[PDB]
Symmetry: D2
Subunit: 151 residues, 4 copies
Amino acid sequence: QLAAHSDARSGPVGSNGGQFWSFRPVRPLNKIVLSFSGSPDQTLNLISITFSSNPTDIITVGGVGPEPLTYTETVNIDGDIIEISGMIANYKGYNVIRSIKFTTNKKEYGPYGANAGTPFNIKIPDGNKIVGFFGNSGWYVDAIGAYYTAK
Amino acid sequence: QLAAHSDARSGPVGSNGGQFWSFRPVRPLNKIVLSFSGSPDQTLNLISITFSSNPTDIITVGGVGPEPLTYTETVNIDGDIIEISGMIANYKGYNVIRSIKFTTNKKEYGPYGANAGTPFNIKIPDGNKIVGFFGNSGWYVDAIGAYYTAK
Amino acid sequence: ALQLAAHSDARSGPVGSNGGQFWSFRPVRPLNKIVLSFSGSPDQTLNLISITFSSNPTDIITVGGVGPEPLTYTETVNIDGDIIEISGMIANYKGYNVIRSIKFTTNKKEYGPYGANAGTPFNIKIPDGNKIVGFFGNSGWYVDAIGAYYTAK
Amino acid sequence: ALQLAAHSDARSGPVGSNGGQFWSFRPVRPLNKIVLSFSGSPDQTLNLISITFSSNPTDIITVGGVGPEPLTYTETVNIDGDIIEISGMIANYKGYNVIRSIKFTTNKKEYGPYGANAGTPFNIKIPDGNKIVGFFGNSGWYVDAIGAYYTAK
Ligand SMILES: CO[C@H]1O[C@H](CO)[C@@H](O)[C@H](O)[C@@H]1O
Ligand SMILES: CO[C@H]1O[C@H](CO)[C@@H](O)[C@H](O)[C@@H]1O
């Protein structure tokens, strides 16, 4: 028997939330869907984030609550994610993730979401890429951290 | 800011494998699909396991390889998983998980798969239930461990 | 023979910021002593440099600055019960965002805060019915981040 | 202010079996000393009771049996380089499936195996280009399970 390995982690950032969640697919996590209530002209409220690498490897964090989704944004990442960032602010009594941006060596995706709050940055040791995420969530996305491994 | 929490883990059991994977959905992980090559009368070879809690929260471990799937088994868990077990044996040069069984307080599901190999048992501290899994995988399922939290 | 999966404790945190090295200390027996070392003075401003955690003479960890230091201020905490909460403040020092203040809370007594009362506050609480049995974080010249290992009482 | 996510090292293992308490020790500085304590005798059979890991006098952990023990056999290992691999054997002792043998390997030297050469073998290797900077596991009266924390050289 050869001992199995578990990827290093960066984070989480954010606050304690109802449930722990973790998603680290074998294949490149390359598609993210952000869902919000509200509207662009009257502030977008991040409710849930859906991460996937393909049709049968996907997770939805936050969005457990009844609040109807009004707006969705699909992001297709074509490269290796090396950092994510965003803002944290209160929403209906909880400190949640309100905006998020993803950064690869080539380009940047976002920020998506609200514009106010306290900033967070999840970076990883040089020579690595982000291959999964974990955090705390319930009706909203409370905390988030990333799994990383060598490029 | 209130520090986020991360669930305890039991395992992994098995051997090092190409890629680390992790799946801990917010909602009850209640459906498992086991896919095999071969056949019941000539030995079933576990190739991949698909875990899910609903249509948009699912992961497939193993099954990256070309080997065509010939047989699938769907298991619907209606309760709280407290333990899993199975056998580990060699398959085309790798020590992989060859059979698996899931045990709840009410009933047991399986074993499913081959019948030979060295046994493994993933149990958890009393008063807890399994809410996710993690492990190593590539073409096959190399290692597996579980995330647990209070019932 | 038989592989019977081993368990790892749940975690709360880390909070703070990325630091040089990752560190971890979860001893088998109860933590019962914490030594905080600072430059400066309480009459003025205390600069938290290192934290020494231990459960006994042969189970101890030192995180944060350990190199050369002249006359330093020390604070020794002797814990009696189960630590259930930790808090403090984070702020910048010599170019690094480090833990500047820290307070340890058990059901029996509250210890601290110790240090400089300025910066962003942090709080490490754990699920009811649990106890903190270890800590982990990042550290270099100072204490950059910290989190806690917990398990059921 | 700003939350800059802290990093935690990758892990290899644990191997062995479930034990009483989870334990963890990842010191900032290089491990450089390991003390193994056994009942029995090398001329006969050595029963591994505890492992003491340390990087210096103020960074040490003791896992496994610590209670009363008469005359015990000791083995002190002084590590020089980066530990890259650990191995040993697991077998039953007084009703528990514990670590019975262990060997530590660095690029410069191999230390062990130490203990009883019987039972199921285990091997903790890490991804090429990395080094072991800590260990974790389960322990009680004996050493039940062990795994390693690793990071890039
Ligand atoms: C509305 O309450 C729910 O959702 C929030 C936020 O996501 C969680 O913190 C909380 O524990 C519940 O799950
Ligand atoms: C066939 O090789 C691939 O699949 C095996 C098993 O699942 C992994 O161990 C290996 O690293 C590769 O990913």
